[PDB]
């Protein structure tokens, strides 16, 4: 049978040193009384204000409510995507920013303070890690450049429905074995754990488990976590090892600081993209007579791709969460209004393209060129629309509370003459395909 080790086992420390060395551990004691207080009160403050939410996530094609409740805090405009769900930051106050409710704002400041301290620690541990290998500095600093933390809460008494750990008999899992997605390559992750107050790991206490990827022969590690212990995954650990969370019996919070790989995941980035798409529009005035500067296939393809990007990675992702951030802050209210306007204009662009493709004096070579440059984009738009609407109407989603109910948005009826094109592109895509096979 597969087995596991905790500090009670003779072989624990040396197995740690041999098969999990890039896993570091700083016990509550390395951290000041002061910061412990501030940070814990900050957790309880967010919890009281109802700021943590279960994500209606996706996994092997199945909609599933995560047993754990979460919240994302970080640099303004930043996102972190896991399990097909883009979490938007509730902003903490980096330099250059000034706003979002009192006690909540103060909690954000506090997790920024925590972010700072843990960063300093991570850099020190990676320095040590290298000098241990000795027998760039900018790489280290960018691998500890935490731009977000993902907070988690679970109260096992309230959230009993928990799976047994299958390979090492670690007992009950809060979070099953996984790799953390969407992180900068080789970037560290720093977790502050806070648990509110014989053969194997003690079930009453929280543990983080690690195993080697592909491997259930090498026994796994189960590391006990009390109030205020911190652990760190350094470097390639998150890629070479898997981790899970073993549930104790008391509620527990954690702050999991990460370098989210946000090259296509920031308000700034998606605004530059929308703008790039709108470069193809005549923009003297904002009205519905949409007229484009060019129908070169490359420019049109690009436009429709950006159209999809803002619709499905930004708008539908944001509204699937049914405006639950509105509880914590309004930071994204204006930006999302603006992205919605940019997208509406793009529905305008697509319409103008469909107008061209139907234009009498257009040589069929060129028409077919247009079709072949946009067809993929439009069928992807259709398939992703079926997906999001269904995901918004699924039995599970309809049972969430009213301030969390998924919201299929934007959405308009075929009768709605405010919008230039139907929500259901099925017929249109059929038509374009048919044209493309005309002898
Ligand atoms: O399959 C599961 O039960 C499961 C549970 C989780 O909590 C996570 C995952 C899977 C991920 O895949 C993942 C990826 C990137 C960052 C993350 O934080 C997670 C998770 O947290
Ligand atoms: Zn994880």
Residues with CB under 6 A from ligand 1: 59, 82-83, 175-176, 178, 180-181
Which atom number of ligand 1 is nearest to the Cα of residue 68?
7
Cross-strand pairs, 253? 153, 194
Q: How far apart are CA 39 and CA 71, in angstroms?
A: 15
Phi/psi at 244 (nearest 5 deg)? -145, 170
Q: Is 72 helix (H, G, I), strand (E, B) or coil?
A: strand
Dihedral sign of CA atoms 8, 10, 14, 20 in order: negative
Residue pair 279/200 in contact by the 8 Å Cβ criterion? no
Where do breaks (C to N over 2.5 Å) occur in the chain, by preceding residue number? 99, 135, 197
Indicate the top mutation candidate among 55, 82, 165 to test ligand 1's pocket, ranked by most ligand atoms within 8 A of CB: 82
Q: C-alpha distances in angstroms, 213 versus 5, 20, 27, 179, 236?
A: 17, 12, 26, 9, 12
Technique used by the depositors: X-ray
E-strand stretches of 290-437: none
Is 367 annotated to bind a ligand? Reply is no
Which atom number of ligand 1 is nearest to the Cα of residue 150?
18
CA-closest candidate to residue 22, choices 225, 233, 244, 187: 233
Distance 68 CA to ligand 1 centre (A): 10
Say if strands 53-59 and 23-26 run parallel, antiparallel, or are unpaired. unpaired
C-alpha torsion angle, residues 193, 196, 201, 204 (rounded to 10):
-160
Q: Is 41 helix (H, G, I), strand (E, B) or coil?
A: helix
Q: How far apart are CA 93 and CA 327, in angstroms?
A: 18
Q: Which fold has domain 4-266?
A: Jelly Rolls (2.60.120)
Q: How far apart are CA 413 and CA 297, in angstroms?
A: 30
- The domain limits of the chain are 4-266, 267-400
What's the alpha-carbon Rg for the chain, to the nearest Å?
25
Q: How far apart are CA 316 and CA 392, in angstroms?
A: 10
Q: How far apart are CA 258 and CA 318, in angstroms?
A: 21
Provide DSSP, 159-199.
Answer: ----EEPTTT---EEEEEEE---SB-TT--EEEEEEE----
Q: Which residues make Cβ contacts (< 8 Å) with residue 224, sequence separation at least 6? A: 6, 7, 201, 202, 205, 206, 207
Burial class (CB in 10 A: 0-12, 13-18, 19+), 392: buried
Phi/psi at 386 (nearest 5 deg)? -55, -45
Q: Is 317 helix (H, G, I), strand (E, B) or coil?
A: helix
Q: Which residues make Cβ contacts (< 8 Å) with residue 350, sequence separation at least 6? A: 304, 307, 378, 420, 421
Q: What is the helix, strand, coil percentage profile of the chain, to 5?
A: 40, 20, 35
Q: How far apart are CA 314 and CA 90, in angstroms?
A: 15
CA-closest candidate to residue 318, choices 252, 227, 242, 409: 409
Q: How far apart are CA 72 and CA 74, in angstroms?
A: 7
Residues in the chain: 439
Domain 267-400 in this protein, CATH class: mainly alpha
Cross-strand pairs, 87? 80
Indicate the top mutation candidate among 86, 148, 175 to test ligand 1's pocket, ranked by most ligand atoms within 8 A of CB: 175
DSSP, res 337: H
In this structure, the residue with its CA closest to atom 9 of ligand 1 is: 178
Is 79 annotated to bind a ligand? Reply is no
CA-closest candidate to residue 419, choices 311, 334, 320, 335: 311
Residue pair 98/116 in contact by the 8 Å Cβ criterion? no
Phi/psi at 117 (nearest 5 deg)? -60, -45
Resolution reached, in Å?
A: 2.6
CA-closest candidate to residue 357, choices 286, 422, 428, 274: 428
Residue pair 212/19 in contact by the 8 Å Cβ criterion? yes
């Amino acid at each position: 049978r597969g087995s596991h080790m905790t500090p009670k086992d003779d072989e624990f420390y040396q197995q740690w040193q041999l098969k999990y060395p890039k896993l570091i551990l700083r016990e509550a004691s390395s951290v000041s009384e002061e910061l412990h207080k501030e940070v814990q009160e900050a957790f309880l403050t967010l919890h009281k204000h109802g700021c943590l939410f279960r994500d209606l996530v996706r996994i092997q094609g199945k909609d599933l409510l995560t047993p754990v409740s979460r919240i994302l805090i970080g640099n303004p405009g930043c996102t972190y995507k896991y399990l097909n769900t883009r979490l938007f930051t509730v902003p903490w106050p980096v330099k250059g920013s000034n706003i979002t409710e009192a006690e909540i704002a103060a909690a954000c400041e506090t997790f920024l303070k925590l972010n700072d301290y843990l960063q300093i620690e991570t850099i020190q541990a990676l320095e040590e890690l290298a000098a241990k290998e000795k027998a760039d500095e900018v790489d280290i600093k960018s691998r500890a450049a935490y731009n977000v933390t993902l907070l988690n809460f679970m109260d096992p008494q309230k959230m009993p429905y928990l799976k047994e750990e299958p390979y090492f008999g670690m007992g009950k899992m809060a979070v099953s074995w996984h790799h953390d997605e969407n992180l900068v390559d080789r970037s560290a992750v720093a977790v502050y754990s806070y648990s509110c107050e014989l053969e194997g790991r003690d079930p009453d206490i929280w543990h983080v488990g690690f195993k080697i990827s592909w491997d259930i022969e090498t026994p796994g590690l189960a590391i006990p976590l009390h109030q205020g212990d911190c652990y760190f995954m350094l470097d390639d650990l998150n890629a070479t090892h898997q981790h899970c969370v073993l549930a104790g019996s008391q509620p527990r919070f954690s702050s999991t600081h990460r370098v989210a790989e946000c090259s296509t995941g920031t308000l700034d980035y998606i605004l530059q993209r929308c703008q790039l798409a709108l470069q193809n529009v005549c923009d003297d005035v904002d009205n519905d007579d949409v007229s484009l500067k060019s129908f070169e296939p490359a420019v049109l393809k690009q436009g429709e791709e950006i159209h999809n990007e803002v619709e499905f990675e930004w708008l539908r992702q944001f509204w699937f969460q049914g405006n639950r951030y509105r509880k914590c802050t309004d930071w994204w209210c204006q930006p999302m209004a603006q992205l919605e306007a940019l997208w509406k204009k793009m529905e305008g662009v697509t319409n103008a393209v469909l107008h061209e493709v139907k234009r009498e004096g257009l040589p069929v070579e060129q028409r077919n060129e247009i079709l072949t440059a946009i067809l993929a984009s439009l069928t992807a738009r259709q398939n992703l629309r079926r997906e999001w609407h269904a995901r918004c109407q699924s039995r599970i989603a309809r049972t969430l509370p009213a301030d969390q109910k998924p919201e299929c948005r934007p959405y308009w009826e075929k009768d709605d003459a405010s919008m230039p094109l139907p929500f259901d592109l099925t017929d249109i895509v059929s038509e374009l395909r048919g044209q493309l096979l005309e002898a």
